[PDB]
Design a protein around this ligand. Structure first.
Ligand SMILES: [Cu+2]
Ligand code: NA
Length: 181
C-alpha cells in the first residue's frame, strides 16, 4: 500500500488540499464525481489479482483509478490538475509506502503531444522506455527511494507508476501530474 510521494500522486495531492473542501477546481471536481472517501484511501489504488496483466485489466480512461469505481473521480480529463514542476535529467523518485511489499516498480511518462483534456489511455504512455525501474527497494522512513531519468519534454505530462508484488498477484497504481514548462 502506498502512492507516489515525489512527484506527488494526483490522489495524494487532492488529499493534501483537505478532501472535505478542496482548494483546486480539479480536486473539487474529483470529489463531486467520486466522493471524499477515495482521498482518505489514497494508499489503496490496487488490483488484487493483476499478475502483470495491467493493460488487459485496465480500460483506457480508467488508469488513474485502476478501474475501481471508488476512485473514479481521479479519471477526469482535466487541463488543470495541480502539477509538480520537473526538468529533464536524473530524478529521484520517492514512493510513500504505508505497507512494504516485495516487488517491482515501473514508472512511465506520457509521450510528446499529451493532451490532459482527453482521457488517459495506455497509448498516451511511453511504455517501451520506463523512466524508472526498481526491484525490491528497501523501505526507510515510510518511503522507497529510487532513481531514473526524465527525458526531454516541453509542457504538461503525467507519470504512471505500476507496483507489481512478487509474493502476490496484487499491484498498486499511481498517476502524478507534472509540468516541464
Ligand atoms: Cu499493501
Ligand atoms: Na496532467
Amino acid at each position: 500500500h502506498g502512492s507516489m510521494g515525489d512527484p506527488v500522486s494526483r490522489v495524494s495531492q487532492c488529499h493534501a488540499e483537505g478532501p472535505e473542501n478542496p482548494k483546486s477546481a480539479a480536486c473539487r471536481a474529483a470529489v463531486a464525481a467520486g466522493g471524499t472517501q477515495a482521498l482518505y484511501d489514497w494508499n489503496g489504488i490496487r488490483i488484487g489479482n493483476a499478475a502483470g496483466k495491467h493493460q488487459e485489466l485496465i480500460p483506457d480512461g480508467r488508469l488513474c483509478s485502476a478501474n475501481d469505481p471508488a476512485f473514479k473521480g481521479l479519471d477526469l480529463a482535466r487541463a488543470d490538475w495541480p502539477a509538480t514542476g520537473v526538468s529533464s535529467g536524473s530524478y529521484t523518485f520517492k514512493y510513500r509506502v504505508t505497507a512494504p511489499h516485495k516487488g517491482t516498480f515501473k514508472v512511465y511518462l506520457t509521450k510528446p503531444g499529451y493532451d490532459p483534456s482527453k482521457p488517459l489511455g495506455w497509448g498516451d504512455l511511453d511504455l517501451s522506455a520506463p523512466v524508472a525501474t526498481s526491484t525490491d527497494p528497501v523501505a526507510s522512513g515510510g518511503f522507497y527511494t529510487f532513481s531514473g531519468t526524465l527525458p526531454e519534454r516541453s509542457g504538461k505530462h503525467l507519470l504512471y507508476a505500476v507496483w507489481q508484488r512478487s509474493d502476490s498477484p496484487e499491484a498498486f497504481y499511481s498517476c502524478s501530474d507534472v509540468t516541464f514548462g
